Amino acid sequence: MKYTGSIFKRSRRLGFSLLENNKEFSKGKKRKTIPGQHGNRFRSSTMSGYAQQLQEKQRMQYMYGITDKQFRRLFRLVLKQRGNLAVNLFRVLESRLDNIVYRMGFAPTRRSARQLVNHGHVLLNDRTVDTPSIILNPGDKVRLKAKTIKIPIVKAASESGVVSPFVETNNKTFEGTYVRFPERSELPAGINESYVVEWYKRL
Amino acid sequence: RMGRVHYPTYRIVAVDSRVKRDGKYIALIGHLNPALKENKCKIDEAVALEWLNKGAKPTDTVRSLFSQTGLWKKFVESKK
Amino acid sequence: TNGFEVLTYIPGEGHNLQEHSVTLLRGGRVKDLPGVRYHIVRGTLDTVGVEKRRQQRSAYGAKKPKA
Amino acid sequence: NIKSNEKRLRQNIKRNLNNKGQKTKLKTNVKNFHKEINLDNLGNVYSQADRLARKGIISTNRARRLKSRNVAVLNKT
Amino acid sequence: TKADQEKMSIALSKLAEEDPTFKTFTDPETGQTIIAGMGELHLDILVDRMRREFKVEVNVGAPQVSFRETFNKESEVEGKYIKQSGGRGQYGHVKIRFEPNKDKGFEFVDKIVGGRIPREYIKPVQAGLENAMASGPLAGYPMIDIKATLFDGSFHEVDSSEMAFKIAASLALKEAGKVCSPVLLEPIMAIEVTVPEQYFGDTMGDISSRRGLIEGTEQRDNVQVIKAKVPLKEMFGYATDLRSFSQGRGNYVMQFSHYAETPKSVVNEIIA
RNA sequence: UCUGAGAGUUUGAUCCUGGCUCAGGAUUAACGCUGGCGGCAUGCCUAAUACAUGCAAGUCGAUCGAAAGUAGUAAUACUUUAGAGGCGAACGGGUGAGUAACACGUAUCCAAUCUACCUUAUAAUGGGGGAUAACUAGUUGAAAGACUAGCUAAUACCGCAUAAGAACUUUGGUUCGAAUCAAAGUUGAAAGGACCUGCAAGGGUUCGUUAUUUGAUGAGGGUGCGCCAUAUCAGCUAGUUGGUGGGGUAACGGCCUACCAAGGCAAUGACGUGUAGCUAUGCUGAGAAGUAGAAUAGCCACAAUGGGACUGAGACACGGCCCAUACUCCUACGGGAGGCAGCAGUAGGGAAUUUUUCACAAUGAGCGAAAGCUUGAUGGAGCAAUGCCGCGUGAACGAUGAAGGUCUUUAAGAUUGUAAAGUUCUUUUAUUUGGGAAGAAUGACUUUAGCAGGUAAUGGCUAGAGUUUGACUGUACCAUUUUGAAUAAGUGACGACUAACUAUGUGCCAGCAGUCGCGGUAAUACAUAGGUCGCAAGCGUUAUCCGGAUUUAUUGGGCGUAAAGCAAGCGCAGGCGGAUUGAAAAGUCUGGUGUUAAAGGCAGCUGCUUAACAGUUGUAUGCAUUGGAAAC
């Protein structure tokens, strides 16, 4: 599926907000309990190495919305490069257009960035992109010619800008550019990329 | 020829104009994409000179590129 | 369709055998019934098919629930 | 069938009768040489070989081999 | 042959694409494939397409819808099955009442007061009855319209088991059915015929001569209407007996009415 | 350093010998449920089973006479060819029945070969004859046609002059079955067409001809290696094993003939049998390898079946021929006609594998100075979730959480669920409007500039010319291009492995079933409702290849009680083999070189929306020659 549908429902069982904390933290209350009418006490009756591996992988693609075939595509792409493949893959994990736009102060959510990108409001280097999965590279210019005045969302994101060294942006001129590869310390550390690359040899 | 639909390609070959294409070749000389005309090729004109010395006339429209190689300046006028 | 008169099973609740019913089968062994390694697809050219199931109706061919 | 095969037939049938005549007269010359050995029929075969090998009627190798064999067996006479 | 059945079904697929008004039924009991037709020429042309257009060679017979079975005045017998087939001992024994019920199907009434049969065995024995009536000693049709009243029984030690009681009840049911002179029931259709004037006496004499239950006249606005409860076998050729006499200007409505007692003549005909 | 993850499973229990199952991939994939679409291909594997229809390989009039028709008073010019003459036809495409072997691939040998059209290289490109084609008239029938007699053309056919050069003959002169030269003997060379020029003479262009020498191409021939299993298949073999002569093939060759003999092979497995198109390679594993030889590419076999011949450089010729076979069709019944393993399409089969679709736009192939013609190749386009890649069905905020429902089991709460309602916004796609391609940086075409032997001049050639070529395509996509959340999500599992259970029904029955196994009275195992979770326009099921399985274990296992030691000895061949000295290096390693096509992957680059993919670049096994190495 291109979208998880309900995203707070994803944080229900996971217990982790895809936002900083405010996803299921301020909507009336904080519902961080796992779903299920069969709910009961569960403290160490459902967690295992296989289960934690699934949890890490699941939150990893939830943060980016990668389908299985695209997931293997990205895996092969990071195979195409050498070094510590886990951290290099994690650097490639930011190479999503919607993720960058969210991190560029141009969209409050990556979901909104994806749906702007498909709508055609984005200009990627003199080439409007409707596919939000294109791979970022350093030194790319973007424009928002005219489908931005009628969008309050992009302006609201522009005033709530994001500071990042790996990219540059003029939010008041609707300008963004990918500068350098991201740093691991700027990104959440609860994810373990090693177990997944061990899990991906099954072709 | 090869490539994709809406994406033609044909590697230029000094092949016998009487024997079919897409087979064993004595020597492949150049390549070109006829979709977008920009004249990118890897012509040699070294063994092609020998091929023309022993006939080996390439396909129909190669003569135009032969004009670009300027072999007419060095092949047909080489007896005077 | 050729001359191979072999055993089979009817998987699922009920049956639609007509003593001449033309239908489709399934290849797979069953442990409790020795000599029997075959089934019948529910809903192929003779069998009715069963709906209102989050279960089979992917197998045991039956149309998607209509509401 | 097709018209092209009809035209090829209408041509090569007569060309083949002609070639049959030429081959049979060459055969007759070979016969007359087999009867007795002389320079006159040697010249006759010399001429006929050039008459027939000129076209595709007789292969050059066959004519050369036969004339070489006949002149070789003549060399002892 | 069963292969002939399959090839005739292929011919059915070919012949149903032109006009599917003909109905085809494969009966679960009589077994023979019933195919509907208009008349002599209609069936003839179907046969012609089958043998010549379709190259399908199939034998032709007679329509098949047979009967139902029941039995006479009540009686009470016992069932004792002390037997074994496979590795150890088996035993069972029950005592039931075999009573007819003209307007009700299988019915069970218990008479266990002294603990002769535990409640666990109350239900299986019923099933033993429900499967035992399926066969008849005359022609083998299931026996219906019967009231069953279990009276007594005996549950022994490990030799006793529920299916043994079911088999004993089956023995009792068959024995009592043999004793109580079983009888047969034939299907009866209610046929209504509306004719202006022409075939009043013709239909009267046809029904009187062939078979049927009749009572006089109905006088509709400008026509004569006759309803007959007639055995379904009597429709054989009646479709053309009436039509030939009516020159093709006949019509009726065929509706099933009920199963009725078979006379002695029917008892002599159908049996082998 | 290229590079390796298992799980459960007997029993009171423990492992062990050891089987099983699946977790993983792949697949011409098939089926179910469903299903907007982009881009990338592919899309009979069943019956070489039988087929209507169309194309399917034809071209040249400036090769030839003449015919028909137009214009023109006529001559003549022009339009088409009924035909001849020249060439293509053997290209190419498709199939895998056959074939278990020079067939593939590979290294080399052809002291034993050939190879129009295209390369080099020269000699010239005459003198005639005599014929027919076409046609005319007659005969036979509806007609196809067939038969008979008359007239002729051809760069057609056949003699006649010389043969430069070759080849043969003979003599002299060469080389480790060879090759080269000289002289003499003999033989046989062409055909003309068009154009320019020239009063003419004649000259030139150009096409073609003949013979000559030389490329290349393709074919044939020689072997070595590699190229299934079968000994519950041990003898086979008389053209068989060789020799002499001859015929014979482009050459050698019992290939064949006459004569002469009786060998030859085969236990390291012939023959017989069934199974088979082969390779590069697709996929599975780290690999040794397995899988199958998809499609494509190279090679071989076939063209309804068995032969046989036919010209032609080249065929025993998909779509040439005769016979015979078998079939089909027409016949107004006398006789004929044909072969989709070509494009499709059609019938059967299966679960199933698609359009008798368009243009020859490009490419290519053929014919032709030329224009121009053919081109069911080719390129497209149609269809199919068949695989691959890619995208939506909304999005910003938004509640102690709307309504209903569920559990809790009347009580709260959770729960469905930021999902909802609500405000706001948007439009790739749905859909109106205009733009909008390259593909043709080719090809034709004449005058110019120039080159060029000639020059009297056209023509031979290179740089610019436009009238020239688009099915694809006013196409994809794009300026809120019109409006608009509007045009759209299912599937499986939820006892464990395997991250996924509550309520109800239920009674070893109903049924699930990959295994362990569940269900006989409240089943987290079945069936429904709800909920959970995972993948997703795919998810479920089946088959089959592999990983897991190293579980026929050189690599990478054992033989005592499990499966394993013949009951033992003699015991050939073969295998393994005491020490020391030498050489060769046969084996081996290694250096130089060549070859091992492309395409496959590994990596870099480029074009793609990153993307699969296409192109660019290189990467390699293996074999042969030559120089060494000396340990074994």
JSON list of C-alpha atoms in Angstrom, two decimals, chain B residues 8 11 13 15-16 22 25 27 34-35 37-39 42 48 50 52 55 57-58 62 70-74 76-77 79:
[
{"chain": "B", "resi": 8, "resn": "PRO", "atom": "CA", "xyz": [16.11, 2.60, -30.83]},
{"chain": "B", "resi": 11, "resn": "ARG", "atom": "CA", "xyz": [25.66, -0.30, -33.51]},
{"chain": "B", "resi": 13, "resn": "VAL", "atom": "CA", "xyz": [28.98, -2.32, -38.48]},
{"chain": "B", "resi": 15, "resn": "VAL", "atom": "CA", "xyz": [29.06, -5.77, -42.57]},
{"chain": "B", "resi": 16, "resn": "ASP", "atom": "CA", "xyz": [28.40, -7.40, -45.93]},
{"chain": "B", "resi": 22, "resn": "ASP", "atom": "CA", "xyz": [22.56, -9.42, -35.96]},
{"chain": "B", "resi": 25, "resn": "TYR", "atom": "CA", "xyz": [30.91, -9.73, -37.36]},
{"chain": "B", "resi": 27, "resn": "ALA", "atom": "CA", "xyz": [34.68, -5.95, -37.07]},
{"chain": "B", "resi": 34, "resn": "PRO", "atom": "CA", "xyz": [18.72, 7.36, -34.51]},
{"chain": "B", "resi": 35, "resn": "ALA", "atom": "CA", "xyz": [16.02, 8.62, -32.12]},
{"chain": "B", "resi": 37, "resn": "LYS", "atom": "CA", "xyz": [20.07, 13.03, -33.79]},
{"chain": "B", "resi": 38, "resn": "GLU", "atom": "CA", "xyz": [23.34, 14.14, -32.22]},
{"chain": "B", "resi": 39, "resn": "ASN", "atom": "CA", "xyz": [25.84, 11.99, -34.20]},
{"chain": "B", "resi": 42, "resn": "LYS", "atom": "CA", "xyz": [32.89, 5.31, -32.08]},
{"chain": "B", "resi": 48, "resn": "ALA", "atom": "CA", "xyz": [37.36, -0.01, -42.18]},
{"chain": "B", "resi": 50, "resn": "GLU", "atom": "CA", "xyz": [40.99, -2.51, -45.19]},
{"chain": "B", "resi": 52, "resn": "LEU", "atom": "CA", "xyz": [36.73, -1.08, -48.19]},
{"chain": "B", "resi": 55, "resn": "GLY", "atom": "CA", "xyz": [34.82, -4.48, -50.66]},
{"chain": "B", "resi": 57, "resn": "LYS", "atom": "CA", "xyz": [30.25, -2.40, -48.28]},
{"chain": "B", "resi": 58, "resn": "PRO", "atom": "CA", "xyz": [28.27, -1.54, -45.12]},
{"chain": "B", "resi": 62, "resn": "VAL", "atom": "CA", "xyz": [26.42, 4.41, -43.94]},
{"chain": "B", "resi": 70, "resn": "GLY", "atom": "CA", "xyz": [36.30, 11.99, -44.92]},
{"chain": "B", "resi": 71, "resn": "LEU", "atom": "CA", "xyz": [37.46, 8.68, -46.39]},
{"chain": "B", "resi": 72, "resn": "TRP", "atom": "CA", "xyz": [36.45, 9.98, -49.83]},
{"chain": "B", "resi": 73, "resn": "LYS", "atom": "CA", "xyz": [39.33, 12.42, -49.38]},
{"chain": "B", "resi": 74, "resn": "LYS", "atom": "CA", "xyz": [41.65, 9.45, -48.79]},
{"chain": "B", "resi": 76, "resn": "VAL", "atom": "CA", "xyz": [38.60, 7.10, -53.88]},
{"chain": "B", "resi": 77, "resn": "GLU", "atom": "CA", "xyz": [41.25, 9.74, -54.68]},
{"chain": "B", "resi": 79, "resn": "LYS", "atom": "CA", "xyz": [45.60, 6.59, -57.24]}
]
